[model samples]
Target: PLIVPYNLPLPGGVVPRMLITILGTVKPNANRIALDFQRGNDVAFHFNPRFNENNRRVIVCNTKLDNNWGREERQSVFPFESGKPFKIQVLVEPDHFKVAVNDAHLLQYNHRVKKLNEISKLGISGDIDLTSASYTMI
Candidate 1:
């Protein structure tokens, strides 16, 4: 199993038509997990899946600039479950990032940080067992 709180540099940075994949299983007692695409200290994209927040299951997406977090984009359609494996795909487009969970399209977040090529880091943390993480052009 891949280690938790893994961080890696994207091979060639991000661009349109690139696809990022993550495979993992949520811990039985998982409360949340986060995947972040970062440029230096700023998070260009923050993908967080919450098992419980105010008694609701949701996915929250956002961006953090200059240490300040932007408004969150939350989706109520939850596709994750405790102790179950999941496949997450992030498709990079010219204007936004499209996300899919378990082969189903989940949500898209518009680019708040427009310099996609500067998004050179990937980070995964929280309650999950990471199986694999990779990126490819598509």
Candidate 2:
């Protein structure tokens, strides 16, 4: 029941310094939650937290170019808990995006596509509460 927007035109387009914050509550029986930033049809950044994907615990970060998925960066230490709320922040820099989960530094992902402004969309899904979800750009 997630009602995330498909895309939103950045006011004057995406710039060198953009920040995104997402707040939501995880479902009790949830398995995963994915946050994706996209440009048109290409996925610029993908942050997926898998609680029990194949009985494993990990966080995956990846990029997709022209419908092709790139290499994934996986983190074994998860900072989220089911049936709890979380706050995730992503800062867009010149060369990479810095991410933090629940106010704790998580990881930095290097930009795969140099055209920063092309990333004009944000997509979110998985077993999180849609009613209490909100996002802000700062």
Candidate 3:
């Protein structure tokens, strides 16, 4: 399958002030990639980065539930490189999620579905090759 989503179970779920790390390489000619925080069928956070599509680069963040999608938040800067390894660190906060790439701060996404602990599932998909991924409780 072209769109393969990698799922990681959070041991204690995502609590306030937690951190999630994802290390991976963007495949050459990558189209898009995403990391999702899921609770059953509901997606709390959908972190998507689209490359070379729809007016160049974008990091789109949103939430989905009951077959509905929230307003998409787009980031202007694109720091990922194709065929290169990168590390992404996400800080789970009380009201939002802070994201950083390669040790540099990227952006923050406000909590559409609060109650961080209910985020029991982590999903990764699109044109990325994940080498490492994990979440730590704080």
Candidate 4:
């Protein structure tokens, strides 16, 4: 399948802190793509987060997301939290950003700074949605 352009409206650019969570799983593999903070027609946040990534944690993980009264299994590395937003604070780094969701209880992580292609597309699966998001790269 071809990569579809999908972008949700955001308040501002991430000066440093950022958090993202996917509900469904496209595949058992990681997605590749670069994050475009889109500023002044120049992608400033194009560099690898792994090179200077930091503050990492486990957000959430469970074998039950789209609980349709069927077999429960982990859809993604992290459990899906409907309407839950990834909290971005105290997270300092390029790629390694600490993520929190579900009342900010679970801690998650995103590593960068390797190959830009690998970080571009996010392989997802099952039924999911981008609930809430925010970032700051100062």
Most accurate candidate by TM-score: 1
Candidate 3 Cα misplacement greater than 4 A, ranges: 1-4
TM-score against truth, every candidate:
0.97, 0.87, 0.92, 0.28
Query: Which candidate order results from sorting by TM-score in descending order?
Result: 1, 3, 2, 4
Residues 81-104 of candidate 1: C-alpha lDDT, one tens digit per residue: 999999999999999999999999
Taken over the whole model, the C-alpha lDDT of each candidate is 0.93, 0.79, 0.86, 0.30
Evaluated at residue 40, the lDDT of candidate 3 is 78
Q: Which ten residues in a row have the lowest lDDT in candidate 1?
A: 4-13
After superposition, which runs of candidate 4 have C-alpha atoms over 4 Å from their true positions? 1-5, 8-14, 18-95, 108-110, 114-126, 129-138
Candidate 4 local distance difference test against the native: 0.30
lDDT per residue for candidate 2 within 52-107, as digits (tens), equals 97898899999988889999998887998999988888888788988888889999
lDDT order of candidates, best first? Answer: 1, 3, 2, 4
Residue range 49-89, candidate 4, lDDT tens digits: 11111332122221111222222111123433223333223
Give the per-residue lDDT of model 3 (tens digit) for 1-138: 223578888865787778999988899988899898997789999988889776689898999988799899998799998888899999988888899999999999888887676888899998888888877776
lDDT of 2 at 45: 86
In angstroms, how far off is 78's CA in candidate 3? Answer: 0.7
* Candidate 2 residue spans exceeding 4 A from truth: 1-12, 131-138
lDDT of 1: 0.93
